[PDB]
Assembly symmetry: D2
């Protein structure tokens, strides 16, 4: 299997001014869409297993499903636990052979966030897998919110996370108003924190703002909603036109194909196309 | 894992006048729908991997996906290769640890069908997995067709198949005209062939004809199209009502739930509910 | 697989006045000897993978070898990492699916021992596997006693599930007969109130083992004496027939004599028949 | 894993005037000896799992043990079932993911041998693994030659990829020096035109091996001589120190001496460096 530490991927992206796309998976077709995109683009990629799919499918089953679809894949892949709020769940992903974990202590006090994140990072460092933490809440779309540079620095130094999620103008879900990222804040963090930044709420952010953020040290861009939209739209083109089309290979296949093209588009936006060669 | 030879399942069904449902799988949600149904019904079940899903997902990946979803399953499960027209493909399923295989030589001459089916059966017998063969073409829905008792007997004795697919009034797909099964022919085969019969084209056959066929020795009923219809209808209830519902857990979840209820209905039709206790 | 948390095994032993034998494995035959013994005795067992076998065979290979021999085994089995002096190595055992780990910080300062042992314990608790730590050096026989207060403090700060302490044993063939610190064990039974692990279990007189178990020893580590038994079995064959090249015969005999030693230890420990308690 | 069809290995050897060594495994140390040898020599190798080790350790466990030791191996490896006299057992090896099988019908009538061997070969061809059959009994040394016409007929009716024939070898330690039937091998090279398997390869003089390989022997089976080497290594340690209980030392030495024997056989066979041809 071509599985690689998320730290190896993110640091290479960070050092060369591109980003790794971190694409949320939900089932078989979504896994295949992402992997086929990465393989086509000769790009390293992260597949994110988050809280919702863990509640529906289970953590270990989703890991095993990825494994089952890796047989023909040659590009660097990293399975990443997204938005974990439990030390136990994060350790379960470690035990199941994930290449990256996010412990999201962002709803905890500063001190508790630090304590658990550091514990998770010490395990990740020991086993050469990536660790992500978050300082500052990032909510849903449905000035004060922005993470300070000093807070990011202190959190970063106390936890030793490999890559850091901060609050910089994004939110999860379909954007009601177009977001405007805190570019000055990203630049400060690049100079002072000096760690790869993770952009949460990557779906629906204008392309130009993504490209700029990446030049300022965003090295991981999380995308979920926009892929689910693409998948759903592909399914709809089929079932709306032919409600009695019962061949799942056709209806879900189209969802898969449309999602694949979205993932290709994101890989290219992020600058990660061709970068598989850097890891061979 | 609670995996059991398809021969053990089918013979028990045959000996006690019920049938094992053989439910075609296509992806993660369809697997889960079938397994959750079987577990709820305390029923033995077959999961069929056929030609279409092998072309989309691959043979080994689908096997591995089933494995990944078996963690919480206690009822007897048998993974079955459906409609294989290649000795190689059938041997690949054997190598991948299937519990049952169908080599479908029905488009070959009688002698070639016999030759390859026998070869497949000798391997199946050696490894204690189920083997299914077919004599007589069963086409699509879109007197002469009916398999003779003598042909079924000769094929059966030359091949040593464990369970036998024959042409008895069904066809694959959505029925244009309601089918009428060849009940007299089934009764002859029960008395003379004396092997469990497999009913292909089980989707959309009237319940009463299914129940009667089972009393005449049909012990495996294959169902695919009707489950795909149920899955598709569940997805449609969601996406038609809310085209912008992008939570796959909701849209595909509903497909999964509606398919699960169809599978429950089929298990009960077939008489296999509660029969897990017979194998504990 | 019939794999069980080391904590489940040890707590049950501790509550019921018996001990789990923790038998060191080295290769295929030694694994099978221990498993065949446990199955015969219907006993829960720990198989210990320690530093020596990790250097020779590798951590993950030895884990996978145990897995390969578990096909016909029904009794509770716990794979346990022995004498780990590295957080990394201990995390590797966790990642490879061990059911128990010992982080042995006994060569570190009290504070460092506590710090790393606690980190290890938090991971073990999260994943429902056993954690063992050690306070007090336990050396070799070729070459003292842990205080009750130190054992208590270490135990409460680390949250280990079972605790190795220095109570008069040593690793290796004993030159002189050991005498266990029974008074100290008894204090610990009342004050520390955790299952105790006895290191250096090889060659300890049976009656001292039985008494130690009543005072709260719930895990007894045995390695040298099994390797002696294995080596003696091989010798009976090769000394008698130097040209006996059938390994099934020479190493088979090592395996059989080792199996009987393991049976003897299981029965000494009181763990025979106890598989029933965990079904 | 660097696992390769036995047919790919043997055909390449046959085409290039060398042979693949087929080394019998018995346990962890013997597996590692063979693999470490192959890796050192950058040689393709077969590891043979035969009847004895199946009775002691089990077919699937030995397969899984090899898997566990392949983590650091880069050279072509083929796991091969040796001396199977059962269609069921041969199918079990196929199901467990072996890269080559021998169905040995040599104690059956010609017709039965053909029937079962052909059935086995059809499965092997379907799954791209090697198939070996045998025509002519090959016995033991403690206790003849296959005709060219019989070898041809058997070969054409079974479609085996490589063929074991009776050409003057026997299993075990040779009492008297063997003399291979070189004239008969040479006939077969021109007429049968299939890679030949040499059973009873232990103790065959080096020069006779080299000549046999030029006449189309492309697989040489070696077991007894490796078990001798392993046993001699163990003896050097236990005879000198009966109380040496460190298995890493006693069995380690067996492993080291066996490794050197395997290196010697690889080089004899001409397979050193040949890993390059398959990358
Ligand atoms: O931060 C993210 C990007 O968000 P958008 O795609 O909406 O822009 C992801 O990492 C999601 O937050 C994730 O879907 C929630 S769960 O853990 O998967 O349940
Ligand atoms: O015989 C069957 C029942 O048919 P219906 O469900 O239409 O009534 C199945 O066994 C199918 O024939 C199968 O879907 C084709 S493939 O091999 O899966 O591609
Ligand atoms: O403590 C033990 C008992 O010692 P005895 O058998 O001599 O009485 C074991 O747990 C050993 O200490 C172990 O062999 C060392 S290593 O880690 O396996 O290298
Ligand atoms: O043919 C062989 C070479 O014999 P020598 O090493 O004595 O020369 C091997 O293939 C053996 O025949 C094998 O040990 C028997 S078993 O099947 O492993 O029990
Ligand atoms: Na968003
Ligand atoms: Na139908
Ligand atoms: Na000792
Ligand atoms: Na010989
Ligand atoms: Zn997020
Ligand atoms: Zn059909
Ligand atoms: Zn010790
Ligand atoms: Zn032989």
């Amino acid at each position: 299997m071509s599985y690689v530490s998320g730290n190896t991927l993110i640091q290479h992206a960070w050092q060369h001014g591109y980003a790794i796309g971190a694409f949320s998976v939900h089932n078989a077709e979504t896994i295949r869409a992402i992997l086929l995109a990465a393989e086509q683009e000769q790009a390293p990629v992260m597949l994110q297993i988050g809280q919702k799919v863990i509640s529906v499918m289970g953590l270990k089953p989703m890991k095993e499903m990825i494994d089952a679809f890796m047989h023909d894949i040659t590009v660097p892949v990293c399975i990443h636990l997204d938005h974990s709020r439990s030390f136990e769940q994060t350790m379960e992903a470690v035990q199941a052979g994930f290449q990256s974990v996010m412990f999201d202590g962002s709803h905890l006090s500063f001190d508790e966030n630090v304590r658990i994140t550091r514990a998770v990072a010490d395990v990740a460092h020991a086993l050469n897998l990536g660790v992500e933490g978050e300082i500052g809440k990032i909510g849903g779309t449905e000035d004060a919110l922005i993470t300070s540079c000093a807070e990011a620095l202190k959190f970063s130094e106390l936890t030793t996370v490999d890559y850091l999620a901060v609050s910089i103008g994004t939110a999860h879900g379909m954007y009601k108003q177009e977001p405007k990222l805190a570019f000055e804040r990203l630049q400060e963090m690049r100079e002072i924190v000096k760690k790869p930044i993770v952009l949460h709420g990557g779906s629906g952010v204008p392309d130009e703002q993504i490209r700029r953020a990446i030049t300022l040290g965003v090295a991981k861009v999380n995308v979920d909603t926009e892929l689910r939209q693409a998948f759903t739209q592909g399914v709809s083109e089929v079932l709306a036109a032919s409600p009695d089309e019962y061949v799942l290979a056709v209806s879900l296949g189209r969802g898969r194909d449309v999602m694949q093209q979205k993932v290709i588009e994101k890989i290219r936006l992020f600058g990660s196309q061709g970068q598989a060669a850097a890891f061979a």
